């Protein structure tokens, strides 16, 4: 396979909803903006230089078309919900939503704009139980890169499946930002369509003296180790067919 430069770059719609704003933007959009165009850029690092089949099919990657900064919360009517109300759900006595319930609705609320762009992808500012820093559709045991369909029967519209979420707060604490760019890689790993590396493959997930674990292992990668920042050859193989299969569907040119 030969890479198309006209149809190598999966464009982002990224969100900023009210808890990033004010606690990693401090209320100012420049601060915010920032923040993302720098991660967005390192993340992109990773990828492009990636070679997915260890040859040439490299020059893949991502690029920020829009960044929507939700400078409040969204006002609701009682019995609705929002990705970006002011409450968590479906405990408001939590700093942090359920994790899956919010990308739903996340996907759901954002559909009319996910229609029209490779990924979109939510940052917040909340503490997921137990760890979780973020979550995806795609690379799963459907959705990810370009928009498909589904059509929700609770929610009574198609939404697409083209999305994921990052928070860049766990236990009680803002991570670092080393942490939170592997978060996002991981993230979008899912969305490219790799799955978890699997302890059996040593290949796959190699130990701490052999460079550690790669961006996909189960277990967040903390940045420290020469592998966190990088994707195992499991997952290269399953990014390098979503890629040959997704590229002439939704990328588009490098800006
Ligand atoms: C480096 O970031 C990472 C790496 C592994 C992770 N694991 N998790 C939990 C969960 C549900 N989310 C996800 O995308 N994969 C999962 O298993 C992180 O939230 C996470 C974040
Ligand atoms: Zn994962």
Known sequence: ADPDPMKNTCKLLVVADHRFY???????????????????????????????????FKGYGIQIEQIRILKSPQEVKPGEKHYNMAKSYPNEEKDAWDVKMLLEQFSFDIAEE????????????????????????????????????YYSPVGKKNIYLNSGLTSTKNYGKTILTKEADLVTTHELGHNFGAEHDPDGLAECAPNEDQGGKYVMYPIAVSGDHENNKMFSQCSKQSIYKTIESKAQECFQERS
């Open 22 to 56: 004010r606690y990693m933007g401090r209320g100012e959009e420049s601060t915010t903006t920032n923040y993302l165009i720098e991660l967005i850029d390192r993340v992109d690092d990773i990828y492009r230089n990636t070679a997915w089949d260890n040859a040439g």
């Open 114 to 149: 996910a229609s029209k762009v490779c990924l979109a992808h939510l940052f917040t500012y909340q503490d997921f139980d137990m760890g979780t820093l973020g979550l995806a559709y795609g690379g799963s045991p459907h959705g990810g890169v370009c928009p498909k369909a």
